Structure 1
Amino acid sequence: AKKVQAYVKLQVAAGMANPSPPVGPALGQQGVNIMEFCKAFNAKTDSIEKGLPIPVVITVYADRSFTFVTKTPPAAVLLKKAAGIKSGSGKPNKDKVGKISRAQLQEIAQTKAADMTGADIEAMTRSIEGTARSMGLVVED
């Protein structure tokens, strides 16, 4: 795509839509009106869910505020809810912190045929797994 005008991502799982203690100014030090955080996020995030951590983009214009677009949950956060332990790594491959499988993973990788760089259904099966592996994973398909 095109050149940069400040677009990154600062937030955790959807526990707060416009939070004070979590991020602070750092998300509204530029042109980010901390109001659109809930007045755009809720205005649009009540369409997929408001409970997984999603990283988004940021678009500030010379006019008023910004429009951000989401798209897919992070691969690593997916393992806390339904795969293994409560947080993830912590103590990775010293012991055997679990046994997921290729099956559980794919339903949240194939569904990403645009935001997941890859014209190969197969790649997502192992690429999303790439995020999910450092947390000490034995693959038992």
Structure 2
Amino acid sequence: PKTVNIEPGSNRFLDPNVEAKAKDIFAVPEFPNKAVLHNWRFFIKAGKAATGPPVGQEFSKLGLKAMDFAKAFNDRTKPHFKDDIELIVRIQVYFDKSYIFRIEPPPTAWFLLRAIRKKRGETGPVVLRGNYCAYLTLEMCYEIAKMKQMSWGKVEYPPIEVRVRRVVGQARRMGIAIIGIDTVHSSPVKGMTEKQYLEESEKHRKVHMIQYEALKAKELESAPLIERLHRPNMAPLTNTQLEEGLKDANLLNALWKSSHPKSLFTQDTRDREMARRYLNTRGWFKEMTPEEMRVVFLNYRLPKQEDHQRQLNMTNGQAQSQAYWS
């Protein structure tokens, strides 16, 4: 009937409304560069924080009337919240006894038992329990994963797809057999043939890549400069080179220069060929002209778009164009 939005994967975030007050409370009062004494962690309900043994005790071990914090908690947690949402409080006590606490969304194990409607003790790993418990489908984990963002300052530091494989694994480890995997058949649809279902995935599953890569590459262009530096791959080196290349570092130097992708500073024939004359005495790579090295001695952690970018630098007007300006 009504599909809310037809786009190849544009629902990777909470509604800007709920994402507005998502980080109003899930914020980190910045580390004062003090020396922490205790990093406590609690489960506390929406606003039902008491001065009892769960909270008031560990303060009272240190002489703090936690009758105050609970109020300062409820100064931030009593509204905004569906009833009975057990949050996690990360109380952090410094050597001046001044605490600083981040409220955090409920533990995903709490989420998982909700989204499947199972109480304490009903769920279990099959090797302890013998049965898969309540089903799920990947479509559901993608929304448990939206309220679980490690950096509640940067809502998607782990990209959402990467975040799901986490909550999926935590689910399977609890017996939550999701349907898209773990089973012979995916979720059956009244829409079309399984082929007309698989032929509509082979396009979607790959359209996501140019979506997922671009989001993985936009991330690296703002990543630490050291990150975009060159780190040659070690899959080619065989484990006797890989060991004979650890006793003398000279080989792991001449290698780096030998296979550095072209730049304005590494277009020195003699510098590149000085290495290439060191390896041959060591009987290392000898039949691989510079090109087929760069395509294998590349930082594999680069997003395909960016490895392709560095690989063709000589084609990119040479890097002889881009230099330290002044």
TM-score by shorter chain over 0.5: yes
- Return the offset for 1:104: 1.8
Corresponding residue of 2:107: 74
Q: Is 1:34 paired with 2:91?
A: no
SS at match of 2:70: helix
CA–CA separation in structure 2 for the residues paired with 1:21 and 1:5 = 20
Q: Percent identity?
A: 29
Q: How far off its partner does 1:86 sit? A: 1.2
Where does the alignment leave 5 or more consecutive residues of structure 1 unmatched? none
Unaligned stretches of 5+ residues in structure 2: 1-30, 181-326
- What is the match of residue 46 of structure 1? 78
The residue that corresponds to 2:300 in the other structure is: none
* CA distance in structure 2 between the aligned counterparts of 1:128 and 1:28, rounded to whole angstroms: 36
For residues 28-72 of structure 1, the C-alpha deviation after alignment (integer angstroms, 9 at most, x for no partner) is: 423543213421111011344252222222233537x53311132
**How many residue pairs end up in the alignment?**
140
Structure-2 separation of matches of 1:21 and 1:132: 31
Instruction: Say whether the 8 Å CA contact 1:59–1:66 is kept in structure 2.
Output: yes
Higher relative contact order (CA 8 A, sep 6+): 1
Pick aligned residue for 2:151 from 100, 110, 114: 114
State the distance in 1 between where 2:173 and 2:159 align: 23
* Number of the residue aligned with 1:83: 116
Aligned-partner Cα distance in 2 for 1:70–1:139: 30
Q: Which has the larger radius of gyration?
A: 2
Aligned to 2:172, which of 115, 133, 137?
A: 133
Is 1:55 aligned to residue 88 of structure 2? yes
Change in CA separation of 1:8 and 1:138 when aligned onto 2, cut-off 3 Å: same
Instruction: Give 1 or 2: higher strand fraction.
Output: 2
Query: Scaled by the length of structure 1, what TM-score is found?
Result: 0.74
Deviation at 1:131, TM superposition (A): 2.3
Answer 1 or 2: which has greater helix percent.
2
Q: 2:162 aligns with which of 116, 123, 127?
A: 123
Please point out which of 40, 46, 68 is paired with 1:8: 40
In structure 1, distance between residues paired with 2:143 and 2:60 = 35
Question: Is 2:33 the partner of 1:17?
Answer: no
Instruction: Output the TM-score relative to the length of structure 2.
Output: 0.37
Comparing 52-61 and 13-22, the one that deviates more:
13-22
Structure 1 SS opposite 2:140: helix
- The 3-state SS of whatever aligns with 1:136 is coil
